């Protein structure tokens, strides 16, 4: 049977980067020709594999993490990068194997009145470990005094909204990102192109 690739790409709503989605795969054949007709222009960078020969590959697990960020920040979705997104929202490992798919979503995710529903984490006492997830909304303690759950000086809400309007520059427009990771369990498979 066919893998639910359209459930990840053709999904109506995408999650915030601080709360990135995660779709488990199992018991299906995976052909990626569906992916090629997805956007007028999109990026398909793979780490250790090529997107063409990757149709002849077998896997035990693939994980599709999807979220929305600025076009400015797609560069941070790569091994060894730094920034608010790589450090405080979504980190890729250095030996990461898999691919990254990103395409402009202005038509879907930006509004003339401004779409403010997509958030990213701005404050964290420590950078994330590769593939770690943090959906907590605790006030960040930036100074000497405790915050008692109240926002103020040295006491900041950790999340901050994107502003997505269609008249912004492309760097500031929303981009939908999908990260494929290739996990190989010591068991048999269900990820082999026809």
């Amino acid at each position, epitope marked *: 049977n066919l893998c639910p690739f359209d459930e990840v790409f053709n999904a109506t709503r995408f999650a915030s980067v601080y709360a990135w989605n995660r779709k488990r795969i199992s018991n299906c054949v995976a052909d990626y020709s569906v992916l090629y007709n997805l956007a007028p222009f999109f990026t*398909f960078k793979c780490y250790g594999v090529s997107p063409t020969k990757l149709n002849d590959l077998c896997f035990t697990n693939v994980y599709a993490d999807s979220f929305v960020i600025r076009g400015d920040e797609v560069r941070q979705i790569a091994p060894g990068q730094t920034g608010n997104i790589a450090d405080y929202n979504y980190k890729l490992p250095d030996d990461f194997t898999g691919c990254v798919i990103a395409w402009n979503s202005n038509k879907l995710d930006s509004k003339v009145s401004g779409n403010y529903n997509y958030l990213y984490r701005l404050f964290r006492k420590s950078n994330l470990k590769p593939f770690e997830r943090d959906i907590s909304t605790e006030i960040y303690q930036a100074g000497n005094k405790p915050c008692n759950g109240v926002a103020g000086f040295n006491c900041y809400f950790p999340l901050k909204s994107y502003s997505f309007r269609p008249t912004y*520059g*492309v760097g500031h427009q929303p981009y939908r990102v999908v990260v494929l990771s290739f996990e190989l369990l010591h068991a048999p498979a269900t990820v082999c192109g026809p």
Partner: nanobody
Framework: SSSAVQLQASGGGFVQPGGSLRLSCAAS????????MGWFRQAPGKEREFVSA????????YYADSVKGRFTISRDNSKNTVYLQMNSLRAEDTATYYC????????????????WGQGTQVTVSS
């Protein structure tokens, strides 16, 4: 192998010295990164010469000395298209203009181009 990009050009024709013209180039397909777009040109009998380039995010702009101050390269915010505004065109601007794409995040030099478009004739004369 790791990219497949098509470039569609528009604009060009015949103008007079001092006149203006707007060239456009549209990118489609897939690539490794949101790379740079730009223009080359080739005068009759001469070799191809770099004209202008821009990163995908309209934050970096490069111009050849022969066109600095006269040409301006910009990007559409709703289309995957890049534009070349050509002001005060001179007779030496007469050339076949080629759109070009680099699949890089940073553009060191103009020289291993990844993709071209079909030529676009621009002639400046009376």
């Amino acid at each position: 192998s790791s990219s497949a990009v098509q470039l569609q050009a528009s604009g060009g024709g015949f103008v007079q010295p001092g006149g203006s013209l707007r060239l456009s180039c549209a990118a489609s397909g897939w690539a490794e990164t949101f790379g740079h777009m730009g223009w080359f040109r080739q005068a009759p009998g001469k070799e191809r010469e770099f004209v202008s380039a821009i990163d995908w995010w309209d934050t970096v702009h490069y111009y050849a000395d022969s066109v600095k101050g006269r040409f301006t390269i910009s990007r559409d915010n709703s289309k995957n298209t890049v534009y070349l505004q050509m002001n005060s065109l001179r007779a030496e601007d007469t050339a076949t203009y080629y759109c070009a794409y680099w699949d890089m995040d940073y553009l060191q030099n103009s020289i291993p181009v990844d993709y071209w478009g079909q030529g676009t004739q621009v002639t400046v004369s009376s």
